[PDB]
Design an enzyme around this catalytic site. Structure first.
Site, PDB file in Angstrom:
ATOM      1  N   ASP A  80      11.335   5.324  37.865  1.00  0.00           N
ATOM      2  CA  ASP A  80       9.929   5.008  38.237  1.00  0.00           C
ATOM      3  C   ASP A  80       9.340   3.827  37.450  1.00  0.00           C
ATOM      4  O   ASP A  80       8.135   3.587  37.531  1.00  0.00           O
ATOM      5  CB  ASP A  80       9.015   6.283  38.096  1.00  0.00           C
ATOM      6  CG  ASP A  80       9.046   6.882  36.718  1.00  0.00           C
ATOM      7  OD1 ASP A  80       9.383   6.122  35.750  1.00  0.00           O
ATOM      8  OD2 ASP A  80       8.692   8.084  36.609  1.00  0.00           O
ATOM      9  N   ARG A 138       4.909   0.704  36.501  1.00  0.00           N
ATOM     10  CA  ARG A 138       5.129   2.141  36.635  1.00  0.00           C
ATOM     11  C   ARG A 138       4.674   2.534  38.054  1.00  0.00           C
ATOM     12  O   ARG A 138       3.549   2.231  38.521  1.00  0.00           O
ATOM     13  CB  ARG A 138       4.278   2.892  35.552  1.00  0.00           C
ATOM     14  CG  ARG A 138       4.318   4.417  35.681  1.00  0.00           C
ATOM     15  CD  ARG A 138       5.731   4.973  35.478  1.00  0.00           C
ATOM     16  NE  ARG A 138       5.709   6.436  35.207  1.00  0.00           N
ATOM     17  CZ  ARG A 138       5.527   7.390  36.137  1.00  0.00           C
ATOM     18  NH1 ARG A 138       5.428   7.064  37.432  1.00  0.00           N
ATOM     19  NH2 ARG A 138       5.575   8.690  35.783  1.00  0.00           N
ATOM     20  N   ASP A 171       6.900  11.107  39.490  1.00  0.00           N
ATOM     21  CA  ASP A 171       7.547  11.258  38.172  1.00  0.00           C
ATOM     22  C   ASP A 171       9.025  11.498  38.414  1.00  0.00           C
ATOM     23  O   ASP A 171       9.392  12.500  39.030  1.00  0.00           O
ATOM     24  CB  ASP A 171       6.910  12.457  37.463  1.00  0.00           C
ATOM     25  CG  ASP A 171       7.314  12.531  35.956  1.00  0.00           C
ATOM     26  OD1 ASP A 171       7.666  11.506  35.425  1.00  0.00           O
ATOM     27  OD2 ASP A 171       7.282  13.649  35.424  1.00  0.00           O
ATOM     28  N   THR A 172       9.826  10.526  38.026  1.00  0.00           N
ATOM     29  CA  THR A 172      11.259  10.735  37.986  1.00  0.00           C
ATOM     30  C   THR A 172      11.640  11.391  36.664  1.00  0.00           C
ATOM     31  O   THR A 172      10.973  11.181  35.654  1.00  0.00           O
ATOM     32  CB  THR A 172      12.023   9.387  38.143  1.00  0.00           C
ATOM     33  OG1 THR A 172      11.521   8.385  37.228  1.00  0.00           O
ATOM     34  CG2 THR A 172      11.797   8.786  39.613  1.00  0.00           C
ATOM     35  N   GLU A 201      13.570  11.669  33.146  1.00  0.00           N
ATOM     36  CA  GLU A 201      14.010  10.620  32.219  1.00  0.00           C
ATOM     37  C   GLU A 201      15.539  10.526  32.360  1.00  0.00           C
ATOM     38  O   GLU A 201      16.224  11.495  32.836  1.00  0.00           O
ATOM     39  CB  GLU A 201      13.563  10.915  30.743  1.00  0.00           C
ATOM     40  CG  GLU A 201      12.030  11.062  30.539  1.00  0.00           C
ATOM     41  CD  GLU A 201      11.205   9.799  30.931  1.00  0.00           C
ATOM     42  OE1 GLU A 201      11.562   8.708  30.438  1.00  0.00           O
ATOM     43  OE2 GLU A 201      10.186   9.876  31.702  1.00  0.00           O
ATOM     44  N   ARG A 209       1.429  -1.086  31.281  1.00  0.00           N
ATOM     45  CA  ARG A 209       2.285  -1.089  32.487  1.00  0.00           C
ATOM     46  C   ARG A 209       1.408  -1.294  33.715  1.00  0.00           C
ATOM     47  O   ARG A 209       0.379  -0.627  33.847  1.00  0.00           O
ATOM     48  CB  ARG A 209       3.125   0.235  32.602  1.00  0.00           C
ATOM     49  CG  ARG A 209       3.977   0.459  31.335  1.00  0.00           C
ATOM     50  CD  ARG A 209       4.828   1.717  31.504  1.00  0.00           C
ATOM     51  NE  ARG A 209       3.964   2.880  31.680  1.00  0.00           N
ATOM     52  CZ  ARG A 209       4.417   4.118  31.837  1.00  0.00           C
ATOM     53  NH1 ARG A 209       5.717   4.330  31.802  1.00  0.00           N
ATOM     54  NH2 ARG A 209       3.563   5.107  32.084  1.00  0.00           N
TER      55      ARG A 209
HETATM   56  C1  LIG Z   1       1.842   7.235  36.688  1.00  0.00           C
HETATM   57  C2  LIG Z   1       0.764   7.102  35.579  1.00  0.00           C
HETATM   58  C3  LIG Z   1       1.104   7.414  34.256  1.00  0.00           C
HETATM   59  N1  LIG Z   1       0.114   7.311  33.343  1.00  0.00           N
HETATM   60  C4  LIG Z   1       0.425   7.663  31.917  1.00  0.00           C
HETATM   61  C5  LIG Z   1       0.158   9.191  31.821  1.00  0.00           C
HETATM   62  C6  LIG Z   1       1.214   9.645  30.824  1.00  0.00           C
HETATM   63  O1  LIG Z   1       0.652   9.549  29.469  1.00  0.00           O
HETATM   64  P1  LIG Z   1       1.512  10.124  28.244  1.00  0.00           P
HETATM   65  O2  LIG Z   1       2.511   9.099  27.870  1.00  0.00           O
HETATM   66  O3  LIG Z   1       0.478  10.295  27.210  1.00  0.00           O
HETATM   67  O4  LIG Z   1       2.228  11.329  28.622  1.00  0.00           O
HETATM   68  C7  LIG Z   1       2.353   8.606  31.001  1.00  0.00           C
HETATM   69  C8  LIG Z   1       3.403   9.145  31.954  1.00  0.00           C
HETATM   70  O5  LIG Z   1       4.403   8.130  32.189  1.00  0.00           O
HETATM   71  P2  LIG Z   1       5.889   8.306  32.122  1.00  0.00           P
HETATM   72  O6  LIG Z   1       6.215   9.384  33.105  1.00  0.00           O
HETATM   73  O7  LIG Z   1       6.434   6.997  32.491  1.00  0.00           O
HETATM   74  O8  LIG Z   1       6.285   8.774  30.755  1.00  0.00           O
HETATM   75  O9  LIG Z   1       1.769   7.509  31.655  1.00  0.00           O
HETATM   76  C9  LIG Z   1      -1.132   6.865  33.668  1.00  0.00           C
HETATM   77  O10 LIG Z   1      -2.042   6.810  32.771  1.00  0.00           O
HETATM   78  N2  LIG Z   1      -1.503   6.555  34.923  1.00  0.00           N
HETATM   79  C10 LIG Z   1      -0.564   6.692  35.895  1.00  0.00           C
HETATM   80  O11 LIG Z   1      -0.919   6.436  37.060  1.00  0.00           O
HETATM   81 CA   LIG Z   2       9.069   9.546  34.216  1.00  0.00          CA
END
Ligand SMILES: Cc1cn([C@H]2C[C@H](OP(=O)(O)O)[C@@H](COP(=O)(O)O)O2)c(=O)[nH]c1=O
Ligand SMILES: [Ca+2]
Length: 129
Positions: free
Chosen positions: A15, A29, A34-35, A37, A75
């Protein structure tokens, strides 16, 4: 919403992808998914799937939603298309991502993606297996 041009810099994982957007390198992103890891079950498959989509594409586009365009990590937040096919929806339809992170105001394609997840789950694909 509107599609805008970008070019691949490099695949990262299921993702996230590095793209050049308005001439600047950015990590994008994918909205609403959510893929796993790379180190979890189906993470390598999800990474491989997105890699093939973005590397094989003649035309990558990014589509921002109505809300935040960058997250707290810098991102880009977008729907990411490869030759007109949305990677976000394609990952969910194949059971390689779950609909997730549905924040009010960046959720234009939520129902499209939920429909795909229902179909992947009915087929018991991958994550749903
Ligand atoms: C998809 C997405 C993720 N995020 C943030 C929430 C999560 O915060 P935390 O890192 O604090 O968990 C993290 C999840 O991304 P990843 O799944 O890439 O780790 O990215 C956003 O803020 N907005 C979004 O639209
Ligand atoms: Ca992910």
């Amino acid at each position: 919403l509107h599609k805008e041009p970008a070019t691949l810099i490099k695949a990262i994982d299921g993702d996230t992808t590095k793209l050049m957007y308005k001439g600047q390198p950015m990590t994008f992103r994918a909205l609403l998914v959510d893929t796993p890891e790379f180190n979890e079950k189906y993470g390598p498959e999800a990474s491989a799937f997105t890699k093939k989509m973005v590397e094989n594409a003649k035309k990558i586009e990014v589509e921002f939603d109505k809300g935040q365009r960058t997250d707290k990590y810098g991102r880009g937040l977008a729907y990411i298309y490869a030759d007109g096919k949305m990677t976000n929806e394609a990952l969910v339809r194949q059971g390689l991502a779950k609909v997730a992170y549905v924040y009010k105001g960046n959720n234009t394609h939520e129902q499209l993606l939920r429909k795909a997840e229902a179909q992947a789950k009915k087929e018991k694909l991958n994550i749903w297996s």
